């Protein structure tokens, strides 16, 4: 829109699912994880120690926290989903964590409500 192809217009994206209505939502949810993986590269091998679970849940809380600091998200919550982490899964290498967080809602549709009254009329003009 706007003069001679001034600018883009539309944060919305083709999605049947309303939750992923904003490209901001999708892009955040994707690139957040790009930053996580490019940083937890060390975590994808290595002999599982007693402190492996904690090394990772803290490493996550580092990258995640940094993103919060620079605006990227608004609060978050990382931990190591217990109802899944088991001896069997661990012997087979696997292990799970949760990373529930909130993304910056792009301000859209500011509703400037306006009323042209005659309240401040006497306050000026008449005599004064």
């Amino acid at each position: 829109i706007r003069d001679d192809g001034y600018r883009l217009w539309g944060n919305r994206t083709l999605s049947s699912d309303s939750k992923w209505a904003f490209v901001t939502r999708v892009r955040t949810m994707d690139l957040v994880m790009d930053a996580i993986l490019a940083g937890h590269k060390w975590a994808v091998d290595r002999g599982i120690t007693k402190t492996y679970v904690k090394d990772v849940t803290e490493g996550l809380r580092a990258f995640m926290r940094d993103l919060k600091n620079q605006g990227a998200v608004i609060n978050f919550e990382v931990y190591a989903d217990p109802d899944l982490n088991s001896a069997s899964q661990l012997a087979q290498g696997k292990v799970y964590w949760n990373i529930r967080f909130t993304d910056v809602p792009p301000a859209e549709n500011p509703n400037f409500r306006v009323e042209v009254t005659d309240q401040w009329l006497t306050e000026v003009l008449d005599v004064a």
């Binding site: 120690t49 007693k50 402190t51 904690k54």
Partner: protein, 166 residues
């Protein structure tokens, strides 16, 4: 039920010293305590703070070679050795008490050679690992570089091992 110790024998590296070893000494297993006196109470109480420096010592009175040839050996805890000791008991059946102790030989003290007295060398292994068994049954197993103070099976540091994350 009188037990008492009858005979004693000492190994270093399989080599039996069936001969020269008129004295053995197992490492005095002691805790560190620290007499805890504190608010709300008169009279201390004392706390498990870990063990003391286990040192064992034997003393062959012969120029034995097989013992002398471990002194100051670069590889601390290369000296192994097993301190066996048979407790008789008035009712015959003797109780084998045996104490393997991988440690560092540390020091060697040949006393006063007097031209008319058992010279008596001396030794004092700074014990690293130490497993004392009675009647073929583990009573102690103290391993510092690992934290494995285990009274007959049950490991009393199994709880601190976790909290340290080892």
């Amino acid at each position: 039920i009188p037990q008492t110790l009858t005979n004693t024998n000492l190994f270093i590296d399989g080599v039996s010293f069936a001969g020269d070893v008129p004295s053995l000494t197992l490492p005095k297993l002691a805790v560190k305590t620290e007499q805890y006196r504190a608010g709300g109470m008169d009279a201390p109480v004392s706390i498990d703070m870990g063990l003391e420096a286990m040192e064992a010592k034997f003393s062959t009175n012969g120029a034995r070679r097989e013992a002398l040839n471990f002194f100051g050996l670069a590889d601390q805890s290369a000296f192994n050795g097993v301190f066996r000791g048979s407790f008789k008991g008035q009712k015959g059946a003797s109780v084998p008490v045996v104490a393997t102790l991988r440690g560092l030989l540390k020091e060697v003290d040949p006393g006063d050679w007097k031209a008319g007295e058992k010279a008596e060398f001396k030794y004092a292994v700074a014990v690293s690992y130490y497993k004392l068994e009675v009647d073929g049954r583990e009573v102690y197993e103290i391993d510092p570089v690992n934290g494995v103070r285990a009274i007959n099976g049950v490991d009393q540091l199994a709880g601190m091992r976790n909290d340290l994350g080892l």
